[PDB]
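Data availability (excerpt). All sequences and predicted C-alpha coordinate strings are deposited with the supplementary files. A representative entry, translocase of inner mitochondrial membrane, is shown inline so that the format can be inspected without opening the archive.
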Amino acid sequence: NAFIRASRALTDKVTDLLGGLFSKTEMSEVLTEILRVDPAFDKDRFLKQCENDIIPNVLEAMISGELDILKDWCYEATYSQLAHPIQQAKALGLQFHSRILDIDNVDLAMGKMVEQGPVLIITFQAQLVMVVRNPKGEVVEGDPDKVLRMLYVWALCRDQDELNPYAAWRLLDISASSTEQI
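C-alpha coordinate line:
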Protein backbone atom coordinates (compact mmCIF):
# COMPACT_ATOMS: atom_id res chain seq x y z
CA ASN A 1 0.00 0.00 0.00
CA ALA A 2 1.16 3.53 -0.85
CA PHE A 3 0.05 5.22 2.37
CA ILE A 4 1.61 2.47 4.48
CA ARG A 5 4.97 3.10 2.80
CA ALA A 6 4.83 6.85 3.45
CA SER A 7 4.23 6.39 7.18
CA ARG A 8 7.04 3.83 7.31
CA ALA A 9 9.29 6.34 5.55
CA LEU A 10 8.58 8.96 8.21
CA THR A 11 9.59 6.58 11.00
CA ASP A 12 12.88 5.74 9.28
CA LYS A 13 13.72 9.45 9.00
CA VAL A 14 13.18 9.98 12.73
CA THR A 15 15.51 7.06 13.44
CA ASP A 16 18.13 8.73 11.23
CA LEU A 17 17.90 12.02 13.12
CA LEU A 18 18.39 10.16 16.39
CA GLY A 19 21.53 8.43 15.09
CA GLY A 20 24.67 10.41 15.89
CA LEU A 21 28.32 9.62 15.11
CA PHE A 22 28.61 7.45 18.23
CA SER A 23 25.24 5.70 17.99
CA LYS A 24 26.66 2.33 16.85
CA THR A 25 29.11 1.99 19.75
CA GLU A 26 26.68 3.43 22.31
CA MET A 27 23.98 0.91 21.34
CA SER A 28 26.48 -1.97 21.53
CA GLU A 29 27.62 -0.79 24.99
CA VAL A 30 24.04 -0.64 26.30
CA LEU A 31 23.30 -4.15 24.98
CA THR A 32 26.38 -5.40 26.84
CA GLU A 33 24.88 -4.14 30.11
CA ILE A 34 21.43 -5.62 29.42
CA LEU A 35 22.93 -8.99 28.37
CA ARG A 36 24.85 -9.22 31.64
CA VAL A 37 21.55 -9.63 33.49
CA ASP A 38 19.40 -11.05 30.65
CA PRO A 39 21.65 -13.19 28.36
CA ALA A 40 18.64 -14.18 26.23
CA PHE A 41 17.61 -10.60 25.37
CA ASP A 42 16.43 -10.14 21.77
CA LYS A 43 15.69 -6.80 20.08
CA ASP A 44 12.78 -8.09 17.98
CA ARG A 45 11.04 -9.82 20.89
CA PHE A 46 11.52 -6.63 22.90
CA LEU A 47 9.76 -4.53 20.25
CA LYS A 48 6.89 -7.04 20.23
CA GLN A 49 6.50 -6.63 23.98
CA CYS A 50 6.46 -2.84 23.53
CA GLU A 51 3.65 -3.01 20.97
CA ASN A 52 1.52 -5.61 22.77
CA ASP A 53 2.08 -4.58 26.40
CA ILE A 54 4.11 -1.50 27.34
CA ILE A 55 2.79 1.08 24.85
CA PRO A 56 -0.96 0.24 25.08
CA ASN A 57 -1.04 0.11 28.90
CA VAL A 58 1.06 3.24 29.49
CA LEU A 59 -0.50 5.42 26.75
CA GLU A 60 -3.99 4.46 27.93
CA ALA A 61 -3.20 5.34 31.54
CA MET A 62 -1.74 8.68 30.42
CA ILE A 63 -4.79 9.86 28.47
CA SER A 64 -7.31 8.40 30.93
CA GLY A 65 -5.75 10.12 33.92
CA GLU A 66 -5.15 6.84 35.77
CA LEU A 67 -2.55 7.97 38.31
CA ASP A 68 -2.16 4.71 40.27
CA ILE A 69 -1.42 2.71 37.11
CA LEU A 70 0.92 5.42 35.81
CA LYS A 71 2.91 5.49 39.07
CA ASP A 72 3.63 1.76 38.68
CA TRP A 73 4.95 2.21 35.12
CA CYS A 74 7.16 5.32 35.53
CA TYR A 75 10.36 6.37 37.27
CA GLU A 76 9.93 8.89 40.11
CA ALA A 77 10.89 12.15 38.37
CA THR A 78 9.02 11.03 35.26
CA TYR A 79 5.78 10.41 37.17
CA SER A 80 5.97 13.83 38.85
CA GLN A 81 6.03 15.65 35.50
CA LEU A 82 3.13 13.68 33.98
CA ALA A 83 1.01 13.69 37.16
CA HIS A 84 0.89 17.43 37.90
CA PRO A 85 -1.34 18.39 34.92
CA ILE A 86 -3.66 15.46 35.64
CA GLN A 87 -3.88 16.39 39.32
CA GLN A 88 -4.89 19.94 38.34
CA ALA A 89 -7.67 18.60 36.11
CA LYS A 90 -9.01 16.30 38.84
CA ALA A 91 -9.14 19.23 41.27
CA LEU A 92 -11.56 20.93 38.87
CA GLY A 93 -13.56 17.71 38.62
CA LEU A 94 -12.81 17.30 34.91
CA GLN A 95 -13.45 14.03 33.04
CA PHE A 96 -11.07 12.22 30.68
CA HIS A 97 -12.91 10.84 27.63
CA SER A 98 -9.88 10.32 25.35
CA ARG A 99 -9.39 7.08 23.39
CA ILE A 100 -6.74 5.38 21.26
CA LEU A 101 -7.68 4.49 17.67
CA ASP A 102 -4.51 2.70 16.54
CA ILE A 103 -0.80 2.10 17.25
CA ASP A 104 1.81 1.15 14.65
CA ASN A 105 5.31 1.62 13.19
CA VAL A 106 7.08 0.56 16.43
CA ASP A 107 10.89 0.77 16.04
CA LEU A 108 14.20 0.92 17.98
CA ALA A 109 15.99 4.27 17.50
CA MET A 110 18.99 4.42 19.86
CA GLY A 111 20.48 3.41 23.19
CA LYS A 112 22.15 5.16 26.14
CA MET A 113 23.33 4.60 29.72
CA VAL A 114 21.95 6.58 32.67
CA GLU A 115 22.32 6.40 36.45
CA GLN A 116 19.13 4.34 36.78
CA GLY A 117 20.30 1.80 34.21
CA PRO A 118 20.47 0.95 30.48
CA VAL A 119 18.08 2.89 28.24
CA LEU A 120 16.49 1.87 24.94
CA ILE A 121 14.77 4.66 22.97
CA ILE A 122 11.87 3.59 20.76
CA THR A 123 9.44 5.41 18.47
CA PHE A 124 5.94 4.66 17.21
CA GLN A 125 2.98 6.36 15.54
CA ALA A 126 -0.49 6.55 17.06
CA GLN A 127 -3.93 7.91 16.19
CA LEU A 128 -5.77 9.44 19.16
CA VAL A 129 -9.02 11.22 19.98
CA MET A 130 -8.46 13.70 22.82
CA VAL A 131 -11.34 15.15 24.82
CA VAL A 132 -11.82 16.38 28.39
CA ARG A 133 -15.23 17.41 29.76
CA ASN A 134 -16.48 19.27 32.84
CA PRO A 135 -19.23 18.02 35.22
CA LYS A 136 -21.79 19.60 32.87
CA GLY A 137 -20.64 17.40 30.01
CA GLU A 138 -19.18 20.34 28.12
CA VAL A 139 -15.85 19.99 26.29
CA VAL A 140 -13.17 22.14 27.93
CA GLU A 141 -10.14 20.56 26.26
CA GLY A 142 -9.49 18.68 23.03
CA ASP A 143 -12.00 17.82 20.29
CA PRO A 144 -14.24 14.70 20.39
CA ASP A 145 -14.63 14.73 16.59
CA LYS A 146 -10.98 15.09 15.56
CA VAL A 147 -8.37 12.35 15.08
CA LEU A 148 -4.80 13.33 16.02
CA ARG A 149 -1.93 11.51 14.28
CA MET A 150 1.12 11.52 16.57
CA LEU A 151 4.77 10.45 16.37
CA TYR A 152 6.15 9.46 19.80
CA VAL A 153 9.70 8.94 21.10
CA TRP A 154 9.89 7.00 24.41
CA ALA A 155 12.91 6.32 26.62
CA LEU A 156 12.51 3.02 28.52
CA CYS A 157 14.92 2.18 31.37
CA ARG A 158 15.68 -1.27 32.80
CA ASP A 159 15.82 -2.19 36.50
CA GLN A 160 18.98 -4.33 36.65
CA ASP A 161 17.76 -5.88 39.93
CA GLU A 162 14.47 -7.18 38.53
CA LEU A 163 14.19 -10.98 38.60
CA ASN A 164 11.55 -11.15 35.83
CA PRO A 165 12.63 -9.77 32.39
CA TYR A 166 9.05 -9.09 31.28
CA ALA A 167 8.58 -6.65 34.17
CA ALA A 168 11.96 -4.92 34.19
CA TRP A 169 11.19 -1.96 31.87
CA ARG A 170 9.59 1.37 32.89
CA LEU A 171 9.02 4.78 31.24
CA LEU A 172 11.79 7.34 31.82
CA ASP A 173 10.97 10.08 29.29
CA ILE A 174 8.70 11.02 26.38
CA SER A 175 8.49 13.55 23.55
CA ALA A 176 6.06 13.83 20.63
CA SER A 177 4.72 15.81 17.68
CA SER A 178 1.68 15.82 15.40
CA THR A 179 2.34 14.70 11.83
CA GLU A 180 -0.15 16.95 10.03
CA GLN A 181 0.74 17.31 6.34
CA ILE A 182 3.25 14.45 6.35
